[PDB]
Structure formats: C-alpha cells, structure tokens
Design a protein around this ligand. Structure first.
Ligand SMILES: [Cl-]
Length: 214
C-alpha cells in the first residue's frame, strides 16, 4: 500500500490545530505587548476568540500578579467560547482562590524567552470544566517579562478531528503527548506483523503511531 504517504497526510492534518494554536498565541502576545489599555485589550481578546475556530475553546492573558487591595492583585483576561458566544471569566482573579501564577501552564512560560511555546498536561479547567491541553508563551514589555499568554485546545474537539481524519484516510492512529498520555487512539491495533509508521512532532512534542485500517 502507501502507508508512509497516508501517515504523512494524516500528520499534516494533526499539525493544523498545533499551528492554529501558535498563530492565536502570536495574536495574544501582540495584544499583551501593545500600549492598549485593559478595556481595549478585553475588546480585542473577545474579538479574537470570537473569530478563531477549530479546536480552540478558551485562553487569554495572564499578567504577572502584584501580590494591597485584594481585587487588584490578579487581573487575568480569560475568555471561554461557550451558546456560540464568548464569555469573559473573572474566576482566577479573587486572591482567596490562590491566583494563577502557580499553575503549570503559567510557570512553564514564566520569564522564558519570547517565542518559546509550552504545552501543558491534559487537565479539566477548574472553571470552564472543559478537558483541555494548553499552549502558553511569555510576553514582554519594556524588556521586562509582563505575563503569560495561553490558548486552550478542546480535547473532545481534537479527538473528533484526529479520529475523523484517520478514518477518511483508512488509518488507525495513536497520538501521545509529551507526558505519555494517550490523547487519541482511533482504530489502532497490531497483529499479524502489521507495519507501524511512526512520526514525531518533536522530542518533547506529540508522537503518532499509524497503521493501515482493514
Ligand atoms: Cl481516544
């Protein structure tokens, strides 16, 4: 057959939500690095999450906190794509609740070099309750680290996309993340010396194993 070719075609599709998330992150960092005030940034972030599609379901800006008046310490700008409307959530900003600067996806990007991207483990967002993977990156202002930008990928949407694509190409696929978690497993099994095509998106990035479907 043409297993290796179809496996590359599948990998190219699996790459789309990855590329898509990076692109949205770059828009977020543009907004964070800009001179826009907070109401203007909220406006642009709402518009951004209104226009993005695919598996992107939520995300936003996470300024370095000022740990005062309790309501002032945290001023995250976090947006969730619900009917089809976009909601801004304030849930991370009450100090009593712990704040956001100790979260894995914040810490991974904190004070890192602009232009580096970090992938969170799978988790259920404690406030939107959506199971997701998060890509994060730092943004800077005046040379000084200013905060973290995030984009959340819906796991459910990613699974449906990867599995539907594999099925169209008459493939089975297992996709694992940088923590070894099985993100998607669609019609994947090995017996009678079936060939497996392996493709790595990076040493600590996603991995796929691909078989022909019968
Ligand atoms: Cl699955």
């Amino acid at each position: 057959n043409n297993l290796a070719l179809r496996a590359e075609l599948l990998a190219t599709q699996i790459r789309e939500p990855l590329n898509n998330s990076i692109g949205v992150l770059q828009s977020l960092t543009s907004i964070g690095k800009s001179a826009a005030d907070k109401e203007e940034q909220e406006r642009m972030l709402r518009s951004l999450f209104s226009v993005v599609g695919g598996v992107i379901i939520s995300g936003g800006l996470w300024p370095e906190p000022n740990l005062t008046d309790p309501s002032l310490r945290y001023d995250s700008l976090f947006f969730n794509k619900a009917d089809g409307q976009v909601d801004q959530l304030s849930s991370w900003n009450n100090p009593k609740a712990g704040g956001y600067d100790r979260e894995s996806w914040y810490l991974a990007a904190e004070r890192e070099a602009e232009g580096l991207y970090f992938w969170s483990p799978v988790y259920v967002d404690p406030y939107t309750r959506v199971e997701m993977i998060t890509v994060s990156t730092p943004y800077y202002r005046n040379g000084q680290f200013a905060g973290v930008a995030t984009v959340d990928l819906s796991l459910e949407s990613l699974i449906q996309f990867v599995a539907a694509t594999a099925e169209q190409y008459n493939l089975g696929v297992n996709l694992k993340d940088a923590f070894g978690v099985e993100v998607v497993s669609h019609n994947f099994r090995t017996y009678d010396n079936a060939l497996v095509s392996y493709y790595s998106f990076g040493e600590f990035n996603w991995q796929i194993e691909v078989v022909n479907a019968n």
